[PDB]
Amino acid sequence: ALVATNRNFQRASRILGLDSKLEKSLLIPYREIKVECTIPKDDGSLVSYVGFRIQHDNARGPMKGGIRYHPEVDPDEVNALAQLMTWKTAVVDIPYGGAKGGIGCNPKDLSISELERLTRVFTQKIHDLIGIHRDVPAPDMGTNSQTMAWILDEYSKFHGHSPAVVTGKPIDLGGSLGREAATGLGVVFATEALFAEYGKSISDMTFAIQGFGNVGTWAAKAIFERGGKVVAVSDINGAISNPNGIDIAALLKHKAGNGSLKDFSGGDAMNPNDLLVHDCDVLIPCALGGVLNKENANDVKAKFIIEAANHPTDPDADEILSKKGVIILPDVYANAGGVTVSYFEWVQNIQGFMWDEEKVNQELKRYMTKAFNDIKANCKTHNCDLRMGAFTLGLNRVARATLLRGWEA
Amino acid sequence: NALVATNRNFQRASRILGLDSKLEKSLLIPYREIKVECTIPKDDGSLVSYVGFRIQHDNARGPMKGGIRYHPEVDPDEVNALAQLMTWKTAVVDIPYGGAKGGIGCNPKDLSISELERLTRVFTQKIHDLIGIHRDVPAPDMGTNSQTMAWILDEYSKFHGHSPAVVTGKPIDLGGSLGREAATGLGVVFATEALFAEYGKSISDMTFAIQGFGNVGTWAAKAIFERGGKVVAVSDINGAISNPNGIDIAALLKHKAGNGSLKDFSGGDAMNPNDLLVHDCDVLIPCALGGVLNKENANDVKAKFIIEAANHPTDPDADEILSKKGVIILPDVYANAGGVTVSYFEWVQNIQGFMWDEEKVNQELKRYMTKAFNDIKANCKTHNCDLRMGAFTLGLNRVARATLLRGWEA
Amino acid sequence: AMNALVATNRNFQRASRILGLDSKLEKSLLIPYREIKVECTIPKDDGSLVSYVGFRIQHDNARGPMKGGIRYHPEVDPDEVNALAQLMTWKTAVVDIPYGGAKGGIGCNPKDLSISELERLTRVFTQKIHDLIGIHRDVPAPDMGTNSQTMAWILDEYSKFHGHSPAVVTGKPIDLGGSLGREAATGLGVVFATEALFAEYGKSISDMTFAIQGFGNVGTWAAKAIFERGGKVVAVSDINGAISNPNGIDIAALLKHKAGNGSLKDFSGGDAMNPNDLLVHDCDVLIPCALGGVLNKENANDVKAKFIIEAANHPTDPDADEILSKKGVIILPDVYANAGGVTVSYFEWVQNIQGFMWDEEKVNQELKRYMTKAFNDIKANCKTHNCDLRMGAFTLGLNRVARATLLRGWEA
Amino acid sequence: NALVATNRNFQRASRILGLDSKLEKSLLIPYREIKVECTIPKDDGSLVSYVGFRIQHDNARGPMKGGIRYHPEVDPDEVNALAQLMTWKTAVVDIPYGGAKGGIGCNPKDLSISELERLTRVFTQKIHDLIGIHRDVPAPDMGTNSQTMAWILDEYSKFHGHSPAVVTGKPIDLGGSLGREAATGLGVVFATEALFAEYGKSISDMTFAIQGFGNVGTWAAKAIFERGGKVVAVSDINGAISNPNGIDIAALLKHKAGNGSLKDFSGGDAMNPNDLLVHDCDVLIPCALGGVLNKENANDVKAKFIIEAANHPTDPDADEILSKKGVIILPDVYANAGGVTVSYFEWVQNIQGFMWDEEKVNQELKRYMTKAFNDIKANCKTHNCDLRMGAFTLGLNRVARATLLRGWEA
Ligand SMILES: NC(=O)c1ccc[n+]([C@@H]2O[C@H](COP(=O)([O-])OP(=O)(O)OC[C@H]3O[C@@H](n4cnc5c(N)ncnc54)[C@H](O)[C@@H]3O)[C@@H](O)[C@H]2O)c1
Ligand SMILES: NC(=O)c1ccc[n+]([C@@H]2O[C@H](COP(=O)([O-])OP(=O)(O)OC[C@H]3O[C@@H](n4cnc5c(N)ncnc54)[C@H](O)[C@@H]3O)[C@@H](O)[C@H]2O)c1
Numbered sequence A: 001a002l003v004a005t006n007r008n009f010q011r012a013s014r015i016l017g018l019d020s021k022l023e024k025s026l027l028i029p030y031r032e033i034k035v036e037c038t039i040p041k042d043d044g045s046l047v048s049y050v051g052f053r054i055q056h057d058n059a060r061g062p063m064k065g066g067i068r069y070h071p072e073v074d075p076d077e078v079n080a081l082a083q084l085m086t087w088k089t090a091v092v093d094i095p096y097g098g099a100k101g102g103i104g105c106n107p108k109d110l111s112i113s114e115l116e117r118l119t120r121v122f123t124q125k126i127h128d129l130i131g132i133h134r135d136v137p138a139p140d141m142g143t144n145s146q147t148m149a150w151i152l153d154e155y156s157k158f159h160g161h162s163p164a165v166v167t168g169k170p171i172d173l174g175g176s177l178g179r180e181a182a183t184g185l186g187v188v189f190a191t192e193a194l195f196a197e198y199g200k201s202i203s204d205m206t207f208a209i210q211g212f213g214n215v216g217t218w219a220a221k222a223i224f225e226r227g228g229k230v231v232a233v234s235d236i237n238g239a240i241s242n243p244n245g246i247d248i249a250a251l252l253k254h255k256a257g258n259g260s261l262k263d264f265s266g267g268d269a270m271n272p273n274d275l276l277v278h279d280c281d282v283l284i285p286c287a288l289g290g291v292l293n294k295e296n297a298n299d300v301k302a303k304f305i306i307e308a309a310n311h312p313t314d315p316d317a318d319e320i321l322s323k324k325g326v327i328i329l330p331d332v333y334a335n336a337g338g339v340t341v342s343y344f345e346w347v348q349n350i351q352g353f354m355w356d357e358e359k360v361n362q363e364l365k366r367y368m369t370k371a372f373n374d375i376k377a378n379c380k381t382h383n384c385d386l387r388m389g390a391f392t393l394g395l396n397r398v399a400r401a402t403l404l405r406g407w408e409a
Numbered sequence B, D: 001n002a003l004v005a006t007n008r009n010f011q012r013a014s015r016i017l018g019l020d021s022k023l024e025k026s027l028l029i030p031y032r033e034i035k036v037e038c039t040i041p042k043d044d045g046s047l048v049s050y051v052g053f054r055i056q057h058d059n060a061r062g063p064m065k066g067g068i069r070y071h072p073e074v075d076p077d078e079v080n081a082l083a084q085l086m087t088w089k090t091a092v093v094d095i096p097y098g099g100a101k102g103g104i105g106c107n108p109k110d111l112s113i114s115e116l117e118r119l120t121r122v123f124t125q126k127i128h129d130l131i132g133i134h135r136d137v138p139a140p141d142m143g144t145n146s147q148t149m150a151w152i153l154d155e156y157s158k159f160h161g162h163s164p165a166v167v168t169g170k171p172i173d174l175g176g177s178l179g180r181e182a183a184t185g186l187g188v189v190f191a192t193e194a195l196f197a198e199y200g201k202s203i204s205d206m207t208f209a210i211q212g213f214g215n216v217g218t219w220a221a222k223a224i225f226e227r228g229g230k231v232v233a234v235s236d237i238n239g240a241i242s243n244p245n246g247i248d249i250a251a252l253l254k255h256k257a258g259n260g261s262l263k264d265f266s267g268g269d270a271m272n273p274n275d276l277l278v279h280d281c282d283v284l285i286p287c288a289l290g291g292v293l294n295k296e297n298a299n300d301v302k303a304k305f306i307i308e309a310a311n312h313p314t315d316p317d318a319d320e321i322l323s324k325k326g327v328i329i330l331p332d333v334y335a336n337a338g339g340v341t342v343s344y345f346e347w348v349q350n351i352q353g354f355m356w357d358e359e360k361v362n363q364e365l366k367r368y369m370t371k372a373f374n375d376i377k378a379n380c381k382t383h384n385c386d387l388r389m390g391a392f393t394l395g396l397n398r399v400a401r402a403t404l405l406r407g408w409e410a
Numbered sequence C: 001a002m003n004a005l006v007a008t009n010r011n012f013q014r015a016s017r018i019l020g021l022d023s024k025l026e027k028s029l030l031i032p033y034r035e036i037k038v039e040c041t042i043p044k045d046d047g048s049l050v051s052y053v054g055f056r057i058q059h060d061n062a063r064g065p066m067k068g069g070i071r072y073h074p075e076v077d078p079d080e081v082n083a084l085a086q087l088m089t090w091k092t093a094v095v096d097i098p099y100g101g102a103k104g105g106i107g108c109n110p111k112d113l114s115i116s117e118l119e120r121l122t123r124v125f126t127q128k129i130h131d132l133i134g135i136h137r138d139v140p141a142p143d144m145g146t147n148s149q150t151m152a153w154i155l156d157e158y159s160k161f162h163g164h165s166p167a168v169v170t171g172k173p174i175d176l177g178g179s180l181g182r183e184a185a186t187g188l189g190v191v192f193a194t195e196a197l198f199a200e201y202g203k204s205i206s207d208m209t210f211a212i213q214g215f216g217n218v219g220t221w222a223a224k225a226i227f228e229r230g231g232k233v234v235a236v237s238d239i240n241g242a243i244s245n246p247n248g249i250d251i252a253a254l255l256k257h258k259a260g261n262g263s264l265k266d267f268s269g270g271d272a273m274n275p276n277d278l279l280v281h282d283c284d285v286l287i288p289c290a291l292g293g294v295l296n297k298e299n300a301n302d303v304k305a306k307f308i309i310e311a312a313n314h315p316t317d318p319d320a321d322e323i324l325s326k327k328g329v330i331i332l333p334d335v336y337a338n339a340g341g342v343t344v345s346y347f348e349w350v351q352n353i354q355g356f357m358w359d360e361e362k363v364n365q366e367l368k369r370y371m372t373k374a375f376n377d378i379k380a381n382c383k384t385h386n387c388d389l390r391m392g393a394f395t396l397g398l399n400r401v402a403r404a405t406l407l408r409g410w411e412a
């Protein structure tokens, strides 16, 4: 997370020839905030936490980023996550900068009313630092749409009804349709555009998918409905194989009945540790980072790797897979459908008028497609891989937004 | 009035949802009640003092919305019920507002046009800090009109900058929306179409008797007529006209515009207005007054559908009698919501800085009335209740879950 | 209470006639600037919901920010609450402090609520009205059912919305900007007003005997302040008993006796008395400091005092007023006599507005200046209108609010 | 050093108060910590980027107060300890402030005066929403001065209007207070009068040795001299001068102003500066550095009183040794508080829109220092502790009382 973002920035920065003093400024966050969050517990005794918000950059618009309720709050990693938000939003051309915040706590130690009091106190402590056009939080580790409802409710006492102050809200409070499928569907839209470069379609390819959660389930469904052959799916408990393509609609039925993959009758049970070296045209890691390293890299038999999980390829595998002719669609772009639909929720709220799910998906496609074209165009200016096309694209957009605004007081 | 009807429907819907009684109490208590002194100098230099008010009932689902009445009758419980009714109505058609109701206890016909302007501006000065484009958005009502709203807009904007969305019902020249005059009558016809689609039928299959021929009745009849429905009977306060082959509503409208009276229309036969509700037809549409259907005449109703365009036309006796006769009643809280819906669209257009054409207003109105009927119908399935309770439980449940999601900690 | 409604109405109508108030101006002065009711819902300590209605009547602000208490009390009759807010508008005008009147509260019984429920309720109430109050808009204060701890919570909650705002509320703890001199303010103000009254006759407090009904916050300090000025306190009663001494009670010793949980009847430096004879006791000066409605037609003819200082609110009903008047009894009216408390409350606001607290000698020096100036104005008014002291005070305050209103004007 | 001394004194005072451990955790966590990018163009057109910061420790007793340091070393733990020490110090002399501390990691010698102005204004733009007359009131510190404050005032006022009280230490021409230069040294002498009055003694009864002759030492020496005290020894970084009759401080000041060195003054005998702390006197006043009294020289101190004007001059080893010899030590947290106290008076005068003359400033400074000593001594009686713990328990408890009164519910 930390180490990948640092290296990718340094690689992209040298490709762009970034001015060293501009680079220094871009690395310094706009603002770092730490606040006391003290609440009474349900039994009346006090507990005290520190909440935080790193606001990295706002050259391209309000800041955007999750709120983590999690006990590990290493400042360098939180800073890297906020920077990564700044580059990711710039890659897909949404008008935001990057931020990241949270509270150093373990939510599983706290009752639902304690979580509410903690969230409202946190909002009271930062209400003057966020805002619909200033900094727009979202769920992350340890928070969810109920958390956002509390932030919305508390913030609105200080500034009036502000549905756009936060994304990831319950539908009943201005949340957007289409959020659940956003990332998985965005993966497939990105893949459509990539394959369009070869005049090929998803229906021409076979797919192996590692991980079968929110990203994995929706990606498989969208691939299956577009004629792709999902020939292998794994998750943490097992794996299933079918050289003629698994009936993914039927597989999802089985999963919903609390069944395990290997027990599916429309395929052959498989060892999950064989999923990455499986023979297929396209590999899509949707589980964990660091699954591709120097060890297994030569044994990957896929022609395309769609990085849906964050950082599944360490630099060792990247170099190895590159020379073999493997094309890797990078994580900062490939899984960006979620943050993109989060932008649409914000847009729908500032417009006072919600979109239907078909409009959400039409705009998601338009944004993911125009983003791939811009990445590919950058790869053609700098003669670099797709990962560097994306990072130079985002880094340059932040840089020239920063330069246009200027430096005088 | 509207108070007995609203309290009864709230209590029935509350029992069906199994609403927690302490949540129920909170939903009944208005967010805020305001009364302000409104004193103006008259044209002749003397002083007069009135009391203005704004009941802000609920804002769990969004900014409050509601009319301003210039009227001498300011009973607090009735005004509370009207504000409460707004909260449920906006929830029924899924527009992101809560309910409010305000006004000034005065008789507008005792005031000259300049006295009315000074009064409107003073009221705005006294409440400007309590309203706003995302807080509470007033609209016309009894005794006020689009000119009143222009004055509120102009005075409010001195305190907060140009804010066309602070009020709806504006003149077209100041950000008012197209499609407002037809909104309610057309919304009734969209609602009636969606109901008939449940039976695979069309408006063109039906005959219609319409009580009332004002802003709602004229536009409802026009929209029915242009869709091939047969409007066989129309009444208003002075008479009624009948034609079993369908009245030519286009000609009836020209007649009304030419200062004509219903019973003098030659393309039909004069009728006793008291025969309207018991007339032989498929669809009855009260568009005039409340309380017209009671235990006396309910058993004499000969229609299969009743589309409630006026507010509270069926008292509980008739609702009972009509149900076990197989009569299907589309409830007023939903059927006439086209007006409040286009009022929302005007706000949306102002918020978006860009007006819609009338085709777009009516396409969205249709989408909103249709999606609302489907949601009502789905509720009927889950709760095994009629359309009136499907609608009230839908709106009440939406307000309750917005409230529960927002929470209670300080 | 109910007596405050009837008394405030009668006094307003009487003063309005003496002044010849224009009836449309009078109609406007009776209509409050603003009436607010808000939902106040909180979780109880057990997690269940409870819902109350809070309210704030903002009667008048022609002369400055509104000022008035917050009552946590179950009886919230609109006409009475309205009368109380209006009474504050007249009271602040009588002593020339730059406030209008307001009155607010929550319909609840505080004894039913734990300290943590009361805090949550207070903060929610503040969240619901923070935009309607303010240091130069409306400044609440303690009242029935609230105290300085309640004010600390309002201050803490209000300041989240507007920054640290110590002047938004008076009656605060000393630790949070409260003023010195609050405890003695009303009783000490009573004695200052009495000094000014007796000066008209070339007499001083050391010349008089005093009978005092009630021995709480007002009665103890008034008796103490009289005693230190050489007045002879010959009778004191409270709800449980009474003590008399025609030579004067050693009030310093009486106060020590009370502080040790002693009863007035059991005091050794006097003779026990029937409390029902306190008002007809043989003295120069009678000071009701307990309850309203104590002087009526039954007993007015038997009052032996030549001066009665109304420290409690409305202790004399209209029947006794007429009877005492024709007997030559001079009545210093409650609206003025007990105004020391609200005056030091203004001083707290002033100290917070100035960012710099006064010492107690300064507070009291100013309290005396304000009560003495106020008496001179009341007396001057009695000269021009040829009326008793009660109407001197009401016409003074009513006229000041009227003139502030007329100067501000009526055009939008 | 401020981190280990402040932590040791807090923990000791907390154990004396029986402070609840969960309250103590809250009191140690700062209200808010801010870091902001401060980038400016240099005079030559190139860019430079610094990090500005503001630690806002506590505001239970009032707006935050604290200096702004332009200095390259910005250790977070040291800056937190300084902001927290401010919170206790303001509570000890009972001024209505909490503690804060901020600055910019830069070397002001590397920057021209116009670059320093732009940097100050950029810093102000980045934090204007976090400071304010009733929120957080900065002041000069290392590397900043009254010209820096004028720039902050000037830039802040573009965002919130003319706000003279947003910063203290301003030039006299822009709302600064009279009496600010002498404030600390004069405050030291007021504190000493209050202490000596407990013994029925006066300053004129005592002999004084002063280490350091800067802004604190010169004014304390002057204020002692005008009260009949005998200043028998003075040192600074380059030398020392001695006179058991009492040095003519008026002449010594005039010598210093004429660019003279202590060892070259003729109205005394030149002395080794290393002998100042062991000089023969009743009262020793460290006004130079911390850590000058330790176990090595503590047994050799001949004074009966030590007035801590410098910060942390006595380590715990010497404090132990001196107390067992019967030495009374007036603690730094109180003794040197005249500077912060007059800074409060500047803020007061600004919010009152009307400046005081220097007579009134010094009169109020004396009243504040006198009442603070009385409160400290009362605390010593209550807890049976020395003056240092009398002062810290006083300040810590006042902050604890204010946060407990304010409460914890959301
Ligand atoms: N959901 C989003 O909006 C989003 C956006 C950007 C990136 N991502 C990335 O996508 C990845 C997955 O996100 P998600 O929401 O689908 O998570 P999820 O928890 O919904 O699903 C994770 C899936 O991976 C499987 N898995 C876990 N450990 C595994 C292991 N060791 N080997 C194989 N399979 C394993 C799980 O069983 C599950 O099927 C993460 O890297 C995340 O950072 C998600
Ligand atoms: N216009 C809207 O947007 C709207 C919205 C919701 C509800 N409503 C309800 O619709 C009803 C009518 O509204 P409108 O705007 O069309 O009013 P309107 O004044 O424009 O027309 C009322 C019509 O009813 C007739 N009428 C009056 N009394 C009658 C009686 N006793 N018997 C028969 N006819 C009678 C009048 O002559 C006229 O034809 C009212 O109940 C109103 O509350 C209107």
Ligand SMILES: NC(=O)c1ccc[n+]([C@@H]2O[C@H](COP(=O)([O-])OP(=O)(O)OC[C@H]3O[C@@H](n4cnc5c(N)ncnc54)[C@H](O)[C@@H]3O)[C@@H](O)[C@H]2O)c1
Pocket: C186, C213, C214, C215, C216, C217, C218, C219, C237, C238, C239, C240, C275, C289, C290, C291, C292, C311, C312, C313, C338, C339, C341
């Ligand atoms: N305290 C103030 O700041 C203040 C200010 C203005 C007016 N007042 C008025 O002063 C009166 C007393 O106020 P307080 O603060 O001293 O009250 P308190 O509760 O502190 O004391 C009231 C006293 O009256 C006594 N008492 C009660 N019933 C009695 C009876 N039937 N006969 C004799 N004594 C009786 C009580 O025992 C007690 O001694 C009230 O009318 C109040 O409205 C008080």
Ligand SMILES: NC(=O)c1ccc[n+]([C@@H]2O[C@H](COP(=O)([O-])OP(=O)(O)OC[C@H]3O[C@@H](n4cnc5c(N)ncnc54)[C@H](O)[C@@H]3O)[C@@H](O)[C@H]2O)c1
Pocket: D184, D211, D212, D213, D214, D215, D216, D217, D235, D236, D237, D238, D273, D287, D288, D289, D290, D309, D310, D311, D336, D337, D339
């Ligand atoms: N000035 C204030 O407002 C203020 C307020 C509170 C505390 N203090 C503390 O007072 C002390 C001095 O402050 P100041 O403003 O007078 O400083 P200053 O820089 O104006 O003067 C310091 C003096 O100490 C002398 N000195 C330096 N090192 C010395 C050494 N090793 N031996 C002997 N003398 C030495 C210098 O020569 C000079 O005379 C510091 O500890 C500071 O933290 C100052």
Ligand SMILES: O=C(O)c1cccc(-c2nnn[nH]2)c1
Pocket: B065, B066, B067, B068, B086, B100, B101, B138, B139, B140, B141, B168, B338, B339, B340, B343
């Ligand atoms: O009168 C109200 O309370 C009110 C408030 C907002 C909109 C509408 C409306 N427009 N058309 N029909 N109703 C009415």
Ligand SMILES: O=C(O)c1cccc(-c2nnn[nH]2)c1
Pocket: C067, C068, C069, C088, C102, C103, C140, C141, C142, C143, C170, C186, C340, C341, C342, C345
């Ligand atoms: O009750 C009020 O309305 C009110 C408001 C502010 C101050 C006081 C007060 N203090 N002492 N006596 N009265 C009363």
Ligand SMILES: O=C(O)c1cccc(-c2nnn[nH]2)c1
Pocket: D065, D066, D067, D068, D086, D100, D101, D138, D139, D140, D141, D168, D184, D338, D339, D340, D341, D343
């Ligand atoms: O530097 C600080 O923390 C600070 C903040 C406000 C005032 C003072 C001050 N004035 N004189 N001595 N100290 C210092």
Ligand SMILES: [Ca+2]
Pocket: A025, A026, A027, A028, A029, A030, A056, A057, D037
């Ligand atoms: Ca930066």
Ligand SMILES: [Ca+2]
Pocket: B026, B027, B028, B029, B030, B031, B057, B058, C039
């Ligand atoms: Ca409610």
Ligand SMILES: [Ca+2]
Pocket: B037, C028, C029, C030, C031, C032, C033, C059, C060
């Ligand atoms: Ca009025």
Ligand SMILES: [Ca+2]
Pocket: A036, D026, D027, D028, D029, D030, D031, D057, D058
């Ligand atoms: Ca803290």
